[PDB]
Write a protein that holds these residues in place. Structure first.
Motif, PDB file in Angstrom:
ATOM      1  N   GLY A   1       0.793  -1.278   0.000  1.00 54.33           N
ATOM      2  CA  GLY A   1       0.000   0.000   0.000  1.00 54.33           C
ATOM      3  C   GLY A   1       0.808   1.301   0.000  1.00 54.33           C
ATOM      4  O   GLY A   1       0.220   2.387  -0.030  1.00 54.33           O
ATOM      5  N   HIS A   2       2.135   1.199   0.028  1.00 50.99           N
ATOM      6  CA  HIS A   2       3.041   2.351   0.139  1.00 50.99           C
ATOM      7  C   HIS A   2       3.545   2.884  -1.203  1.00 50.99           C
ATOM      8  O   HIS A   2       4.058   4.002  -1.276  1.00 50.99           O
ATOM      9  CB  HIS A   2       4.246   2.029   1.034  1.00 50.99           C
ATOM     10  CG  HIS A   2       5.169   0.987   0.483  1.00 50.99           C
ATOM     11  ND1 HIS A   2       4.743  -0.271   0.118  1.00 50.99           N
ATOM     12  CD2 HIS A   2       6.510   0.997   0.291  1.00 50.99           C
ATOM     13  CE1 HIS A   2       5.779  -0.979  -0.301  1.00 50.99           C
ATOM     14  NE2 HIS A   2       6.862  -0.230  -0.209  1.00 50.99           N
ATOM     15  N   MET A   3       3.438   2.071  -2.248  1.00 50.80           N
ATOM     16  CA  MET A   3       3.956   2.450  -3.542  1.00 50.80           C
ATOM     17  C   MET A   3       2.847   3.114  -4.360  1.00 50.80           C
ATOM     18  O   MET A   3       1.772   2.549  -4.548  1.00 50.80           O
ATOM     19  CB  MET A   3       4.542   1.244  -4.285  1.00 50.80           C
ATOM     20  CG  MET A   3       5.910   0.785  -3.739  1.00 50.80           C
ATOM     21  SD  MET A   3       6.534  -0.686  -4.575  1.00 50.80           S
ATOM     22  CE  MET A   3       5.431  -1.925  -3.864  1.00 50.80           C
TER      23      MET A   3
END
Ligand code: NI
Length: 286
Positions: free
Chosen positions: A1-3
């Motif tokens: 979920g961070h990219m």
């Protein structure tokens, strides 16, 4: 979920914006006055629905506020609900209005065509204070129009919209709901087979024919000699009935326009949501 994936969000959002804008251009420019035009309008809504289906699958992110805007207006998951809701309004509300206008358009043209003959049915009388009206030719033409539009087929049915070789019918309750929505008189509600339909209003035509018979029996030539005052009084009454039909058509076209406006306001909510998402994808907080 961070990219992040801004590039693909920009492409997906842009794609949706474009399809929505194209469908909107069609729905704002194309009058619902023929089967061909309505097919174009129906296709434009299909193209919009498909675009929202594609956008739902794209994984673009909505903010809490955009989410809320969409829930409020249309009352992956959110976009599917939006697609369902706007699809229902297009098919069950706007599409019926489109059929109402196209059917009434051709009916009213048929009436207009009869009015165009009236000049030739008014002749000089025996002197300058009298006229001769071809009451027989006029009544025959009106009765023929009444007869034609008293039938139940695709020329006459306002709701449901028709297609294929059958007659699509509704429950009495659904038909009366449309009768009320359209502000049409009770005579427009007709039984057909297992259900009901709503048809064009023939009452002013029928009134015209009544007022013609009221003038008295024609002479040996099938025409009626009349004093000028009597002709004028009859003409006033005839015009009043033309006005009634004109008023009916006006109500219906205005109501169509407002249905088209309601759909367009939903489209604006879509476009604004997508535009806001596009800014988010392009914005870099410093
Ligand atoms: Ni991650």
């Amino acid at each position: 979920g961070h990219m992040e994936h801004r590039g693909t969000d920009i492409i997906s959002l842009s794609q949706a914006a474009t399809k929505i804008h194209q469908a909107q251009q069609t729905l704002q420019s194309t009058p619902p006055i023929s089967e061909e035009n309505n097919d174009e309008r129906t296709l434009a809504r299909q193209q919009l629905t498909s675009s929202l289906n594609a956008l739902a699958k794209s994984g673009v992110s909505l903010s809490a506020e955009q989410n809320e805007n969409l829930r409020s207006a249309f009352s992956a998951e959110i976009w599917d609900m939006v697609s369902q809701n706007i699809s229902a309004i297009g098919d069950s509300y706007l599409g019926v209005y489109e059929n109402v206008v196209a059917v009434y358009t051709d009916f009213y043209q048929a009436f207009s065509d009869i009015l165009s003959k009236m000049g030739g049915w008014l002749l000089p009388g025996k002197d300058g204070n009298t006229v001769k009206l071809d009451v027989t030719s006029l009544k025959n033409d009106l009765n023929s129009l009444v007869n034609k539009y008293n039938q139940i087929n695709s020329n006459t049915v306002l709701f449901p919209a028709q297609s294929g070789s059958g007659v699509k019918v509704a429950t009495e309750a659904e038909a009366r709901q449309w009768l009320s929505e359209l502000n049409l008189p009770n005579s427009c509600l007709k039984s057909y087979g297992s259900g009901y339909v709503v048809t064009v209003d023939l009452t002013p035509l029928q009134k015209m024919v009544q007022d013609i018979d009221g003038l008295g029996a024609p002479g040996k030539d099938s025409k009626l000699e009349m004093d000028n005052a009597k002709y004028q009084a009859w003409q006033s009454g005839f015009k009043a009935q033309e006005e009634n039909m004109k008023t009916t058509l006006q109500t219906l076209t205005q109501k169509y326009s407002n249905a088209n406006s309601l759909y367009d306001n939903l489209v604006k909510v879509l476009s604004s949501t997508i535009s806001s998402s596009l800014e988010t994808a392009k914005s870099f907080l410093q």
